[PDB]
Structure formats: structure tokens, C-alpha cells
Amino acid sequence: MGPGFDFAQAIMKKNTVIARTEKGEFTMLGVYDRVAVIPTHASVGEIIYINDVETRVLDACALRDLTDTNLEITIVKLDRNQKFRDIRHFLPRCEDDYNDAVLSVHTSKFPNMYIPVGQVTNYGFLNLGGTPTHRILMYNFPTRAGQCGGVVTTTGKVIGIHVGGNGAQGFAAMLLHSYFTD
């Protein structure tokens, strides 16, 4: 409808796949080469389905901060025959608050879904499903099951991936440029 949705759509159309694990179907953001991200609660194993194609996982890492606190981001390298567009220049370098964000989801349950979530707070600590988690962004939208892995964008920035909610608020794990240096 506006420039926010324009940037979100451009990311969805070229930098997402549908990932399926034994824990469900997730929106999965491809960042560069064969490297993508997914919430850690997806429990990625040695094999994952990518757009319903059996795919070997070449490498995967559940990220934690230097306090050895959960960040809820898993970085996955896929044995895929095609690279992602490199979007690392859209990643923020530091922890921040944002105005006027969009949460975008693409699964069998929610195809081509875009949600204007408004103001994003650097919330910090969250007890997420009983797990102490750091670097959490919060938005005041009643997100639902099926939206985990959804991409959070502003115009010109890819700032996080949706990891949970409490019925009134939604929570995303930050994406930082430093996670994807090679």
C-alpha cells in the first residue's frame, strides 16, 4: 500500500523460502549465498524441507550472546543449488528501536501476509516459553501461531525475525550485521 510494504514485498519475493521441520512450517529468511535464518525452536536437524524439497543441512548454529544467553536465532547453511540475493547491507549494525515496521509471513497457512505492526521497542530481556532470551524487539500486535520466522522490516532495513507473542504483543529476535560476517 506504501513504501514500507514495498520494501517488505521485495524481501519476501526474493529472500524467503518455506522451511518445514518436525516442529512445523516456518517463514525462513535467506541472507546471502546458501545461508538463512529460522527461530531456534524450529529444532533444525540434518535434513529440512525447503519449498517441499528434501534438503541436507550443511551446517547450523543456535546463536547465544556472550552472557551464554539464548538469542532464538539459528543460522542454517542449506545444500541448495541456488544462492540468495545478498541482503547483508540491509541489516542493522547495532541494537535499536524503530518506527513503522512491517511483519511479513509466507507459509501454506498464511501466504503473502503483511502486517503493519507500528512502533518497535528494543525490549531486551524476555522469558520466551520459559527460556531467558536477549535482544528481543516488541510490537503491539496480537500475533498468532504460524507467524514465527516472519520477517520484520522498516524501509531499507531487515531488523528481526518473529519468535513469539503473549496474545497482545509480538516479539522478534534482532538480526545484526555481525551475525553474518564470513
Minimum CB separation of residue 60 from ligand 89W in Å reads 6
Nearer of residues 101 and 161 to ligand 89W, judged by Cβ: 161
Who's near 161: CB < 8 A, 6+ residues apart?
27, 29, 37, 38, 39, 73, 149, 150, 151, 152, 172, 173, 175
Does 77 contact ligand 89W by CB under 6 A? yes
Based on the residue annotation, tell me whether 162 is a catalytic residue of this protein. no
Catalytic residue among 106, 134, 148, 162: 148
CB count, 10 Å around CB of 11?
19
Does 41 qualify as catalytic in the annotation?
Answer: yes
Backbone angles phi, psi at 82, to 5 degrees: -145, 140
Question: How many residues belong to the site for ligand 89W (CB under 6 A)?
Answer: 7
Interacting residue with ligand 89W among 11, 50, 73, 75 (CB under 6 A): 75
Q: Please name the residues in contact with 111: beta carbons below 8 A apart, sequence gap of 6 or more.
A: none
Task: Please tell me what DSSP assigns to residue 4.
Answer: H
Among 11, 28, 35, 102, interactor with ligand 89W by CB under 6 A = 35
The distance of closest approach from Cβ of residue 77 to ligand 89W in the complex, given in angstroms and rounded to an integer, is 4
The residue ranges that bind ligand 89W (CB under 6 A) are 35, 59-61, 75-77
